[PDB]
Symmetry: C3
Subunit: 334 residues, 3 copies
């Protein structure tokens, strides 16, 4: 019945974001996405700890989907027969049927096609939610991502002025619960099912073993640091499907921040640290002013430095001595 043009999107793995328009002259379309579920054992830290992950499209987080207000988002969710568990998808951006979860439960070997109208603007979590205790377990195993629903006129500052980003990154934060043996080493498991009992026991104690960005300690560092140049306005979408976070750009700010993540609200300005409620996505824009290394963290510094939740930006450009300068280098106290 719905006679609108169809547009396919080629999703890309986080922290990158598929190409899209901010402000657009397009009217509503049916925007087509495919997500293929993958259960897989992965390495989550530099010590070689393994983890029974379950993912949309092979990544933690799942990829960012980007549409505009009033689009219809038509997702083909695929659960190949090489997986062991049923799965589904719930979009916090969608209205009805538990966000879609009640319409998308698929066994291994099945696929389903869900469409929802993007009536709410902002960034939103999506996640698997099979039912009952499986809900938290699938989410904390990695089955969560986000979708961005942009206004057709692009983003604004709440005072009539356009905010336009030069690039966007998606940082998905994952709380992980890896049990330890008697002597204190992390355990490894042969299947998600085998990991479940120990993993649920730990989950209910509410303390993660690892808190990571992009699926792994150090994922967004080194060759895979985020990048910018002085003068570029960067949008950083941050999601956390299960547990609170407090993002902070070390050496920078949130120039414009939607911590509750919803573009019908004006951004806050000039923040040091913002707050992502567990079960949500938020977004912050910053115009880089100084070159060099930045760390992007959750500002529980124990989780940042010790449990995995640090990304880097490497920023090119000219140092601004007006903004900051080392007046006297380290020297012996007189």
């Amino acid at each position: 019945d719905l006679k609108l043009p169809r547009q396919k999107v080629e999703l890309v793995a986080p922290p990158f974001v598929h190409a899209h328009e901010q402000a657009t002259k397009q009217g509503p379309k049916i925007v087509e996405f495919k997500l293929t579920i993958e259960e897989k054992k992965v390495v989550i830290d530099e010590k070689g700890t393994t983890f029974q992950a379950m993912t949309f499209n092979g990544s933690m987080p799942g990829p960012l989907m980007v549409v505009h207000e009033g689009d219809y988002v038509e997702t083909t969710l695929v659960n190949p027969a090489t997986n062991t568990m049923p799965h589904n998808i719930d979009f916090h951006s969608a209205t009805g049927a538990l966000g879609g979860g009640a319409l998308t439960l698929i066994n291994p070997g099945e696929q389903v096609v869900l469409r929802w109208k993007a009536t709410k603007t902002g960034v939103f979590v999506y996640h698997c939610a099979p039912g009952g205790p499986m809900i938290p377990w699938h989410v904390v195993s990695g089955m969560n991502g986000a979708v961005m629903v942009l206004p057709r006129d692009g983003l604004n500052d709440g005072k009539g002025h356009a905010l336009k980003y030069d690039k966007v990154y998606y940082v998905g934060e994952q709380d992980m619960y890896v049990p330890r043996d008697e002597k204190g080493n992390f355990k490894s498991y042969d299947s998600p099912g085998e990991a479940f009992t120990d993993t649920e026991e730990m989950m209910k104690k509410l303390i993660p073993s690892h808190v990571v960005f992009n699926g792994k300690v150090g994922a967004l560092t080194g060759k895979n640091a985020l990048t910018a140049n002085v003068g570029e306005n960067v949008l950083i979408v941050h999601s956390q499907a299960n547990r609170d976070s407090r993002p902070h750009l070390i050496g920078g700010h949130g120039d414009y921040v939607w911590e509750t993540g919803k573009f019908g609200n004006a951004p806050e300005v000039g923040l040091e640290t913002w707050f992502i409620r567990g079960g949500s996505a938020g977004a912050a824009m910053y115009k880089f002013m100084q070159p060099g290394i930045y760390a992007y963290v959750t500002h529980n510094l124990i989780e940042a430095a010790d449990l995995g939740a640090t990304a880097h930006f490497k920023v090119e450009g000219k140092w601004n001595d007006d903004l900051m300068t080392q007046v006297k280098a380290p020297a012996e106290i007189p």
Copy 2:
């Protein structure tokens, strides 16, 4: 000295809310409430775990009190001789004397009458606070509720438009700390006093055993699911007197949300998940658009699914295929 009309309220148990006006032509009144404290052993989960509760009016949470700005709230607090402990009441809505706590300490067999002027609008916690370590213990044993102070012109959107709810529910969330024995089973105690040492030891470790709505796992499900019809605007007041929460309506949104809970501030719009600071009440309005089951959770999904913090709505009406549709039911992958 205060020569204003008096109005009695018949309180009703949560999640229901006593009848009241939103916008009103009444001027200030003395609104009379009675709260009778009850210490009692209750069952908190479907396994039969027991808990030494202490309550206002027999319920967790205590009942919602509703008045208007500039009313005087006159509460008769009763501590029958069948209780074992002193108790008092502190209203976060009130000014002075530790919210009233310093004027309301009553031993078993006593009652006291406190009046406070409702000079601040919003939803607010009330709770017992005897002194010292008894403060957290009485609160986490159940001795907390909330009061709503409405503007005389009713609620507004911050842009000049009335928001009127068709019904209101009060969801009180309770963090509970039930110790376990050596073999791992929850303990039972003969009195609140007998429970105290083990319970305080656990409390100080900051991890609840249970996180429940309306006093029990599953309280707001089944016959006691919350209800609505498509087209109804529902206000959901959420309180948490001791510990943060992140409410979320699965399949819906917060159309208008006061997460800090205070009507002198405009609501935020179109939220997925909001945040109730421990020690506060907040409120969210949603106009239902789709029929069916919704879950209302804290979106730490471990606490929602595994520790008790899930309510349901059952919503009647016509399915809207424009907003969401199952384009293709589950089928074998081609």
Copy 3:
């Protein structure tokens, strides 16, 4: 190159704040501060528990620095040879070089001079951040404080009206991690280095042993209670460099609150409880209306009453029976 007038500040220990102007006719200056690092063993509770602290200027928190928008803040950071560790300073108010940390690493026996331009208004954390796992450890050992960057026109309500405070207090909240021995007593250590292994093991479990204001249980009580008179507008700056908090003034309100702490945003009004994200400072103003004792807490009441996080105000003036009155003192139930 920077040819502006220089002004020295004499810092004062928290919770007091060095003298400053709110609205000012001064233009930009170079405002000079000195911070001298002190590692020291201190007592943190009334039981005599000790703690290996590391501090700016000898205090937890470090002292509040106050400047105006567009000032240049020139800090001489001194690490005397009587300390054991390298240290640095990162200002969340500053732009570049990890907030200054990348320009200020100093060994014992060294000092360094950093200048940054105060381009963002609000209250902000500063803290040590040497690198890697040392970052959280130095912060949770006490090496954090805050800086306030005021608009040159002073504070406003977002509706065109000046807010002027009669006094300001700085409450620095510290999460502390003191390990216990087998029999359950807190451990004591001979040096910060000796404390590190046990302390890091505990840190990674994310549960503090103590949560204190001004460095110690009960620091802001008794002779050192905070004070006010009825009619005085008091600004309370609250910081937490590592972990969330939920401030609340028991018996009062936050009349005007910047919980994210940044003066480019309007305050919220009439709050019961607000939220300080770990890694940030926020601020609340209240005009006292009633005399007597108030408690200022984090409203996780377990942390407030049992882990250390309670301050008092003692307020002088006349009781207002219109706002609150004890209609009937405790009496036998009829």
